Enzyme design. Structure first.
Site, PDB file in Angstrom:
ATOM      1  N   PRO A 102       0.449  -1.609  -0.022  1.00 25.92           N
ATOM      2  CA  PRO A 102       0.160  -0.649  -0.451  1.00 25.92           C
ATOM      3  C   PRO A 102       0.665   0.934   0.474  1.00 25.92           C
ATOM      4  O   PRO A 102       1.717   1.313   1.283  1.00 25.92           O
ATOM      5  CB  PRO A 102      -1.054  -0.760   1.038  1.00 25.92           C
ATOM      6  CG  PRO A 102      -1.043  -1.202   1.610  1.00 25.92           C
ATOM      7  CD  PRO A 102       0.808  -2.013   1.142  1.00 25.92           C
ATOM      8  N   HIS A 154      15.744  -0.292   6.025  1.00 28.16           N
ATOM      9  CA  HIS A 154      16.033   0.803   6.523  1.00 28.16           C
ATOM     10  C   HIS A 154      17.378   1.220   6.543  1.00 28.16           C
ATOM     11  O   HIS A 154      17.435   2.133   6.136  1.00 28.16           O
ATOM     12  CB  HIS A 154      15.016   1.048   7.565  1.00 28.16           C
ATOM     13  CG  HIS A 154      13.464   1.454   7.170  1.00 28.16           C
ATOM     14  ND1 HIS A 154      13.244   0.475   7.384  1.00 28.16           N
ATOM     15  CD2 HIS A 154      12.788   2.120   7.105  1.00 28.16           C
ATOM     16  CE1 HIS A 154      11.670  -0.121   6.720  1.00 28.16           C
ATOM     17  NE2 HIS A 154      11.875   1.223   7.058  1.00 28.16           N
ATOM     18  N   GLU A 156      -4.541   4.629   4.263  1.00 25.10           N
ATOM     19  CA  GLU A 156      -4.101   5.889   2.813  1.00 25.10           C
ATOM     20  C   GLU A 156      -5.136   6.588   2.146  1.00 25.10           C
ATOM     21  O   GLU A 156      -5.139   7.887   1.465  1.00 25.10           O
ATOM     22  CB  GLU A 156      -4.858   4.564   1.753  1.00 25.10           C
ATOM     23  CG  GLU A 156      -3.620   3.088   1.512  1.00 25.10           C
ATOM     24  CD  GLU A 156      -2.327   3.687   1.384  1.00 25.10           C
ATOM     25  OE1 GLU A 156      -2.200   4.877   1.011  1.00 25.10           O
ATOM     26  OE2 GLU A 156      -1.136   3.021   2.295  1.00 25.10           O
TER      27      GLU A 156
END
Lengths: 597, 148
Positions: free
Chosen positions: A328, A487, A357
């Site tokens: 998403p 990350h 979203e």
């Protein structure tokens, strides 16, 4: 003439010439993400090359406008943002080597597979692999092997590459009139020019430490409560005064403690809130979820969506030869085009992801009137906080009961509230100390205070000091485990998560106090309230032209970060944990290790 | 009766009105304070659209001064913003005309709109332009008639 008029003309021309290129790049990225073909890859590469050529031809040209002769704040900020050189200060060979190292590390991280020792032909993937293994497992040796093999196979071929990457980043920082990469990261939280709202790169660390000094007792109580049950879960394995193993936190890295809810349930005889069965019996779909989310977001005073938002978005998995990414993501193509790509299923987490979203889309549409150089949020985690303050409000039992998902014969008791608070705590607070420790370690490595032959030593010391986790097997300086994270290997920060975790509670308390709510904080609901919606829209319309301090003061009345919302929210859970630990031990010793016996 | 037509975006429709400022109402076409006419506009997205950008419409953006009401300007000179003389396109020398590039995948305000303006004039001259009402004919009755 004057320099200000020429600067404004150049900025307007740059915006007019860059909006179309940004729209084309976004369209190419969307066509690449929707259909994975060679033509889409070629189009994306061409769009990226054109955007890079545009950034190069625009750079090293607008340097004829000094910043000491500009009196407008917006023009000065735009000129400072456009005068950023970047990696162009280095030579071509160094940039090519850095790009090659980045591509090699990305290929190594994206291509990973662990083979069985007894059967070399049985090689498993990662996600249909160690993730699902750590998700459901009740064995110690299996998890120990899945941890050791993972950190030994993909943790020994990235040490010199990471060292050279750090060296190149330090050289680039020293070439751009900076100290190190930490200063370049903290430069985002810098406001200079407005009296009474200044902010430096040193006060943030002090505030984070001051907040951690108060969060630490709650984390210690939570760790003690978890260990009190882990001792009975695995006999002869958990020490009563020792730390916890690294391969038993729930996942590979131990960032979230959500998988421990099945073993650390306070009252297992009480039922759980699962609206999935109701949605299956009522035969809902993604369209109904999006309609409910729209009706929820409009009831607070937000405008409706556009026709292209529904006629161009992909909200259903095709399930055919066409392959796509089900991650998403929020896309802002520009020119009034907003699309969402998500493989929505009939579950519970998707109901909150849709609201997240939609909140992201509303935030993107909030500053749609700002110039192209200002179409960005005031902070990195601001969008995530705006999404979470709506997701938590939509995940309340009252909202689910008012829409018909919960039976009206449901009796809310104290045990259900305690279980909900514990489930929220194990998800929110379970990642703050690890994030803080990782960020501090990366800052100390980029600064240069830690020698090269003590990286893993200092890493394990900070682990045992902050998180309280002891390694099952000692590792020498030949491993590269801290760089095995997504990350970390893709040059991403972690302070944004902590800032978002603070801002979400701050905004929640602000909205619940502005809506004149009475009772507990976890029972607050911002539904059917126009005052809170207007107060939020008055701040979301600022965008990036105003500092984050003023935007935070116009909402909560404070300029710095605070932890009082979290304490006021978790006071009942904290009292319950104290009452449960009154007859238990609090604390852990760092001298104990599983390899000591 | 004069008929003026032009193509603008969906956000620039409010700028075509007596007493409005901006870029289109000051550098391309300006209306006076008094204008006894009508403004007609409609959506022409499906008509004027093409993939890969439709670079066929231009507009004047940079000028040294403003346009008077009912003034035409088809100049294509190089705008000067500094103290150095113009010696070709480059530093402090930009082209005054820019392209839009309409696409059918834009939003609701970035679509092409066709606006038609109708101006009325009444001077010391015969009026041969009127507006529209004829009934049937009855006979052998005492009625009222009107024959031109």
């Amino acid at each position: 003439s004057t320099i200000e008029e020429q600067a404004k003309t150049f900025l307007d021309k740059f915006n007019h010439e860059a909006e179309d290129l940004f729209y084309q790049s976004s369209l190419a990225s969307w066509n690449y993400n929707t259909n994975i073909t060679e033509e889409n890859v070629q189009n994306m590469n061409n769009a990226g090359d054109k955007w890079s050529a545009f950034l190069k031809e625009q750079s090293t040209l607008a340097q004829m406008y000094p910043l000491q002769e500009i009196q407008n704040l917006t023009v000065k900020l735009q000129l400072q943002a456009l005068q950023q050189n970047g990696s162009s200060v280095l030579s071509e060979d160094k940039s090519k080597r850095l790009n090659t190292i980045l591509n090699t590390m990305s290929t190594i991280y994206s291509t990973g597979k662990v083979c069985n020792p007894d059967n070399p032909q049985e090689c498993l993937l990662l996600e249909p692999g160690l993730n699902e293994i750590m998700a459901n497992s009740l064995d110690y040796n299996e998890r120990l092997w899945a941890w050791e093999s993972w950190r030994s196979e993909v943790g020994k071929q990235l040490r010199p590459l990471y060292e050279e990457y750090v060296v190149l980043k330090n050289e680039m920082a020293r070439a751009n009139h900076y100290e190190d990469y930490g200063d370049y990261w903290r430069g985002d939280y810098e406001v200079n020019g407005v009296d009474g709202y200044d902010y430096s790169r040193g006060q943030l660390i002090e505030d984070v430490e001051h907040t951690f000094e108060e969060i630490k007792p709650l984390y210690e109580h939570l760790h003690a409560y978890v260990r009190a049950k882990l001792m009975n879960a695995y006999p002869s394995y958990i020490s009563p005064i020792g730390c916890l193993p690294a391969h038993l936190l729930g996942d590979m890295w131990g960032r979230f403690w959500t998988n421990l809810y099945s073993l650390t349930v306070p009252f297992g005889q009480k039922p759980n809130i699962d609206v999935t069965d109701a949605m299956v019996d009522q035969a809902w779909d993604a369209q109904r979820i999006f309609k409910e989310a729209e009706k929820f977001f409009v009831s607070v005073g937000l405008p409706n969506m556009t026709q292209g938002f529904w006629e161009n978005s992909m909200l259903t998995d095709p399930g055919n030869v066409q392959k796509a990414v089900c991650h998403p993501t929020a896309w802002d193509l520009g020119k009034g085009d907003f699309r969402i790509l998500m493989c929505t299923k009939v579950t519970m987490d998707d109901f909150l992801t849709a609201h997240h979203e939609m909140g992201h889309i509303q935030y993107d549409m909030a500053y749609a009137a700002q110039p192209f150089l200002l179409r960005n949020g005031a902070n990195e985690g601001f969008h995530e906080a705006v999404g979470e303050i709506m997701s938590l409000s939509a995940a309340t039992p009252k909202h689910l009961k008012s829409i018909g998902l919960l039976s009206p014969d449901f009796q809310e008791d104290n045990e259900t509230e305690i279980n909900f608070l514990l489930k929220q705590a194990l998800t929110i607070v379970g990642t703050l100390p690890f994030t803080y420790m990782l960020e501090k370690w990366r800052w100390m490595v980029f600064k240069g205070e830690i020698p090269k032959d003590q990286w893993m030593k200092k890493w394990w010391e900070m682990k045992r000091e902050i998180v309280g986790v002891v390694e099952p097997v000692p590792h020498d300086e030949t491993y590269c485990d801290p760089a095995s994270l997504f990350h970390v290997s893709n040059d991403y920060s972690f302070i944004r998560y902590y800032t978002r975790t603070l801002y979400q509670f701050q905004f929640q308390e602000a909205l619940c106090q502005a809506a004149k709510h009475e009772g507990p904080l976890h029972k607050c609901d911002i539904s059917n309230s126009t005052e809170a919606g207007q107060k939020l829209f008055n701040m979301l319309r600022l965008g990036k032209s105003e500092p984050w301090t003023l935007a935070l003061e116009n909402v909560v009345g404070a300029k710095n970060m605070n932890v009082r919302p979290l304490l006021n929210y978790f006071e009942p859970l904290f009292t319950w944990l104290k009452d449960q630990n009154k007859n238990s031990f609090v604390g852990w010793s760092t001298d104990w290790s599983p390899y000591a016996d | 009766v004069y008929a003026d037509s032009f193509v603008i975006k969906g956000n620039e429709v409010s700028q075509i009105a007596p007493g409005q400022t901006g870029n289109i109402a000051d550098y391309n076409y300006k209306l006076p304070d008094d204008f006894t006419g009508c403004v007609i506009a409609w959506n022409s997205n499906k008509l004027d659209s093409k993939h890969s950008g439709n670079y066929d419409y231009w507009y004047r953006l940079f000028r040294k001064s403003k346009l008077k009401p009912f003034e035409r300007d088809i100049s294509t000179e190089i705008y000067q913003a500094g103290n150095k003389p113009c010696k070709g396109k480059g530093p402090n020398c930009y082209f005054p005309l820019q392209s839009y590039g309409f696409r059918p995948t834009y939003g609701v305000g970035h679509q092409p709109y066709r606006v038609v303006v109708l101006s009325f004039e009444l001077l010391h001259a015969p009026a041969t332009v009127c507006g529209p009402k004829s009934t049937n004919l009855v006979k052998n009755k005492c009625v009222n008639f009107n024959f031109n």
